[model samples]
Target chain A: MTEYKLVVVGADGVGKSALTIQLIQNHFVDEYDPTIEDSYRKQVVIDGETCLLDILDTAGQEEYSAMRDQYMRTGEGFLCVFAINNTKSFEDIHHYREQIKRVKDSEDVPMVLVGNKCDLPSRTVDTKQAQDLARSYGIPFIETSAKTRQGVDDAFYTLVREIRKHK
Target chain B: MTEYKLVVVGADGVGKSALTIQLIQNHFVDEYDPTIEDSYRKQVVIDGETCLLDILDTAGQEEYSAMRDQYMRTGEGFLCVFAINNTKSFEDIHHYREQIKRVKDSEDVPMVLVGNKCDLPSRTVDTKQAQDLARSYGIPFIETSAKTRQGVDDAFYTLVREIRKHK
Candidate 1:
């Protein structure tokens, strides 16, 4: 079985966990119910590719995230998410990407730039800016929706393609 | 200045802190630099009809959220967020909504659905589904990007409006 490490990063409420649930269970839970904290790892295949997403559900709260910082050093790919309509989430992408970069210190690592929420059009942010950032970072970018399952599949599949290309 | 209790709810990484920062400081931080743990309090409005928001930034990690159940009990409204693109997050609306319903155990609490990250379209989950869910929940929805200041303004403004209309 082929296994790969993938990390989801963004400000609180960007849907990292729900994306995981959608990918794994195809079901969405609006309430926060959990048996444990910090991280959850599951082995999943995307587009018929074998991979393991060691999802580190980082806390939006500062203190809890510090504890999870240690987990950042272990993954190979990052799903740096930000709302396509929110500038702060986009701005934070630099921080998240940098944090992961600092931990990995490897430019070779593949990162998928995720602009979440295509559900509504009126609340859209600048797509050009997000793409520019991804371009600057040398990463691929895309828009996605968990509710419609729009680019959700692409988040992992694109990353998978990038990872395989790296080899 | 008017003040009210406002709670920020979402799965994780939808930019709750960034939303807070944008509302509080009116500027974007290159990186959110989270506070280490979740925090809740009454946020003062510098200028607005709604004078204060009883702001609560909860932990994305489920274990930590369990400890914060007490806070969820008294919240009057939820700044319900999901990554604009992360389907998992959009799904969290159901989870968090239920959490609020259970914790508050009251009827007719106002909720504003926020689709964070207008900056990334390719990462979207489900557009129609998200809209339908919001419709089903009877909540007004908006897409936002804290980084570009996209819907960041609407987040608080809309929430305040809903709160005011709320009984």
Candidate 2:
């Protein structure tokens, strides 16, 4: 039973759960209630690799600064997400990245920049911007669609491989 | 000093706060935190009509179901948002819609189905599907990008207009 403690983050409602559920159960749960408070657990098998994806899904765009320490204490990797069409979320990534760095400085935990919501035609931030953002941080970028299941597997698989490679 | 109470309901990381800030302030706050046990008040003016938009922003998904009863007690109108990329958020709308209906009854409360993240290309879900979901409940729909400020105002403005007309 190999497991990776991954933190799914972004300003609330970036489909962290959809991606988690899609990766875990291979289905999308539309009409999801985002205001509920609870961390979801799932075991996902990708490319014949049984990897445990412990999604620490957090509150939406609001303050849980107090819990910054808690997330830092537990997370081994970060699957940072932002909706491609929501500029407000992309704008807030700096703060989230800084918070993650401040709390989880050990081993420079590998982070993957996930541009969620790839199935839509309209988007706020472009690939160049996302690439530049990740390039600035030395992290790779992947676009994901939990509904269409696009890049859902690539995003998590890359993280698992990276974690295994470096850990 | 006329005011209208609007609840910003959605899952964690759906750009609810960013949308709230972008709509009222005309700018995005870098590193904005999600609303966890904290709420903010703002004003939106449109078409010679001005109303106070009291935003009831909440915390992490699944944790505040118990507190939603109290939230519904305040808001007269709602902008129930679902990240266009996250189907789960789209699903969450049903629960709140039902709850809000009970408190305000008469689907007359004026709601707009906001399919946020119009700027993300990889995100799941679409404006039409979101519209259909809202149509199922008989509500208008709008796609928004809180990051680029795309339709950021339109979603709230249209919903507010509908609510004002009823008043």
Candidate 3:
């Protein structure tokens, strides 16, 4: 059995908690569950092999974000989330990506750029733009809606796959 | 001199700080400024009356959100923000409104549902949808972009106007 350590990173209110809850807890969370630092573990089989996935859902507040270097050091993969309606959150991905590279001392970090909140009627960030940004970084881009459970499992599975592939 | 207390509340990463900074400081902020209850005062003329607008930018973290009841008590009006890209944040607006109403002990509290990060390419929440939600709550609704400084002042001004109208 293989083990993969993944970290979820995003600004506050970008549904990092909701996405993680839906993925790990296997349910949609409508309430605001401000995560300080929560870890979840589950055994998942990817590519016909048994693997244990350890996910760290990070706090969205900048104060809590100061500890991201530790998370980057510990994680093998990253899920970078931003609300499609919020451009500022999307713009901050550059900072997070740079931080991960600086902290890990590796330019080829396995990561995914996630655009969440796809179930809403107003969208601020388009798929093309997000995909282009992800392409520029040479990583995968996914759109997810924690509410509708759209592309929820795929986001995590894709990250795990990328991590395993890079290794 | 009349003073109006306005507190901005929303889930983490909804650009609450960016919107508030854009309004009070007359500049857009692209970086993450995790607010730990920063307050600003501005003398503004509303309805031909010069009043002190004391604005408080509350923390978006759920840990800090636990202290929101205190802010609700002190605030004369509220700007409940949600990113148009993040539907979960929009859904949490109902929780904030209910909390304010509970703390203030009034059904008709002065507030506005703000959709921030409108300058992005993909938007998850639409103007009509947000406006409709605001109508259901009988509060004003506005879309704003802290990046381009669009509708930032309008959000505050409209909230103040609604505050005076209700008073």
Candidate 4:
């Protein structure tokens, strides 16, 4: 069995918690209770291989910067999350990517850029633009709607694959 | 001449001071000097109009988040800055944005996402990712090398134009 540690980070209300919950438990959360710091562990089968995936869901508040930095230091992979409708959150993807790199002190770390809340109307971030960014960074980019359970699994799966590839 | 107030913000060591000094004095400092809320005033031509631009270069250290919030409240425009060489500073862009919006109690504020320190090698953040993030927020995105003085003027000019456009 293989084990991987991943972290999800983004601005507040970008659906980081919802995306994590959906991915780990196959459930959706409706309310916006800002996360403090939570960890989830699960056993899953990916690519015909059994693995233990541990994900650290982080708070969006700045008060947790110190704690978040520590979490980034320990994670092997990362999910840099943003919301499709919340343009401000979308603009923050680079920040999370850079934070992980800074903490880990490695630019080659496995990561993915995630655009969540895709089911909402009046989307501000374009898919092509996000894909272009992912290409420039050499990372996978995926859009997921946590509300409708769309593309959540693929986001995690891609990160896992990248982690495995890096290892 | 019309006057506009702009503020620069990002995590520490992202070269907020270097970018602001380069814009105001047309000179770059090769050293990393942590800023403590420095303000600069300059006269410039934007959209064929003579304007007085008042810029406040903010400290990126975490302890100054409160003081930074106060500055954000008074600014008519903002330059959300991050360093290309330091990814942690880039990750804090969303925190700065959300803090400004919350303090100002407005979402339609004029702002520009700035990626500074472009002259350095071993870049972790990609230009395309930063630009796409800017597009998502409906703001201007520019990369600046404070050392080389590249794109330094454009960042300020774009912010001024954005402020005028919203007014």
Candidate 5:
């Protein structure tokens, strides 16, 4: 209960790297080695419980994501990511969501639909759709910014909260 | 109010081609047009009123990845199809949904999740999850079988119902 396995997944350039790194801006890169690349770790207090969060960041690998099922199977929770500025990234979210659902084979799983890059002024994916997307997924959503870094940690911690509550 | 523009889209071999042919057996002459788009027309009485259901079929068009904008821009509603037995085809439903939302730039567009090939004893897609996802998108879903021409009329008519709701 002291550790949560989380995966950050979505189309490329949606700032999966930024969201992941923003949470671990300092070096906790050596928590535990996951089989997949672009992974990191951070031990943070969520709801007053100190915990180690192992994260697998699937970013910049948009060209080839044949291995998504592996982490989708292993991770306890996920941040189904997309960019607020990029409509393309936002639309690609279903593929990632379906991948996790297919792998987990569960309609009810631990996840948070993240709208990243909200620090920028040029936004495309609408807030109403964001609400619908999360509502449909039955997960929480937060407009986060890895660059400006608002709600960055909050997003990761929310997954921890979700994982604890998921039956 | 008498005409409805709906597009039938899904991964190749998802029975997109099969669903419509049976829906309009009397009007399927020439079957498909040359623009890599198969157009189908049908008139049905729904809610005690006659309605012309116009469908843009991408059933035979290979590679769902290309040219998402054309029909997406034209069709007011979509029947996103997927084979129940093929998880891969089912995974690509997001492509059409995203494209429609992208082109239309609205989350409240008319659409339906058509789970074709329900007649098969083997199904990778779950009905409960399908229903869950559909409701989350604020859309309706139906399990369809084009082989027996089962649910064929229901699929087209449902989209028209969705169009009515959209208006």
Candidate 6:
């Protein structure tokens, strides 16, 4: 009875698509008859509430200036991700966050900082740094491994809750 | 009868002095004699091996052209400290590591990346990035908070072990 417009955002190679697939695809296979409109859209249940989650992944695409603003304008909640092992991607998160606020025209947007690629042996970004960045933005911070499927559902669900609270 | 010359290298305001003092003072307060030649020099026991650790902290010192090379030439091991919250300091660590290698003329120098000020609520460096950097250099990385004295002993003691192993 509810709809969530959640966006997975990050610099290229930060596993945004993988995380979205981990949550939507894995669940689509196991439960609720595997019915979905598209790969990036899904129906899932959280806290006993059924809802539609339309995901937007910005990755590996040609640098479309207008497309970025178009997505940011509509996203109700953002899962801002960065590959833990990639320093440039971690730094790129700043631009993503600022762009969202700029397009959305609000500092109080619902967002979460996601550090992905934890399955790797080492990382270039520190957990404390990511956590601090999240705190500075007054948003939640979480670490996830898309390959391992850890924290996938929690991340999306948390964003949904953030949006609900903000609404 | 073994002396370990360890150098604390980092950019300005990365808490090199605080970390050095945390390890030396906390230990000197309880065990060992109350006598020391200077503030940066100390004798501590690691793995039941009592030895002298002559520490050189490059903090707020005038950017002397020759002093850095001289210290890098003499030190048996290096602790590269960076404030977790300071991005510039984290980037500065690369030059310090390279400088040591250039001065020592060795590819395999005993070094550890120390992320200081872990107690600070905010940070700019990510744990994965620091850990990856350490792994790339075939060295160890540890986070510490001088104010809280967490991971202080482990860092210095780990450096001693690294030096001993490299020897």
Q: After superposition, how far is residue B28 of candidate 5 from its true place, in Å?
A: 37
- Give me the runs in candidate 2 sitting further than 4 Å from their true place: A46-49, B1-167
Deviation from native of the Cα of residue A161 in model 4, angstroms: 0.3
For model 3, residues A67-137, the per-residue Cα lDDT tens digits are 76778899999999998877778998998899999999999999999999999766768899999999999
TM-score, prediction 2: 0.53
For model 5 chain B, the run of ten residues with the poorest summed lDDT: B25-34
User: Please, what are the lDDT tens digits per residue for candidate 2 over residues B2-108?
Assistant: 77777888777878877876765455555546567545555545787666666666664676476777777777678888887788888888887887888765666
TM-score of each: 0.50, 0.53, 0.56, 0.50, 0.46, 0.47
Runs of candidate 3 exceeding 4 Å displacement:
A64-66, B1-167
Winner by lDDT? 3
- What is candidate 3's CAPRI-style docking category based on DockQ? incorrect
After TM-score superposition, the amount by which residue A87's alpha carbon in candidate 1 deviates from its true location, in angstroms, is 1.1
lDDT of 1 by residue, A109-136 (tens): 7889988876746344677888898898
Cα shift from native, residue B49, model 6 (Å): 67
Question: Second chain of candidate 6: TM-score?
Answer: 0.87
Interface C-alpha root-mean-square deviation of candidate 2: 9.5
The models' CA-based lDDT, in order, is: 0.70, 0.76, 0.86, 0.83, 0.76, 0.77
> Which structure among the candidates has the greatest TM-score?
3
Worst ten in a row by lDDT for model 6 chain A: A28-37
TM-score of 4: 0.50
How does candidate 4 score on lDDT? 0.83
- Model 1 DockQ, alpha carbons vs. true complex: 0.04
Q: Please provide, for model 2 over A55-96, each residue's C-alpha lDDT reduced to its tens digit, 9 standing for 90 to 100.
A: 676655434666666875787778888888778778878887
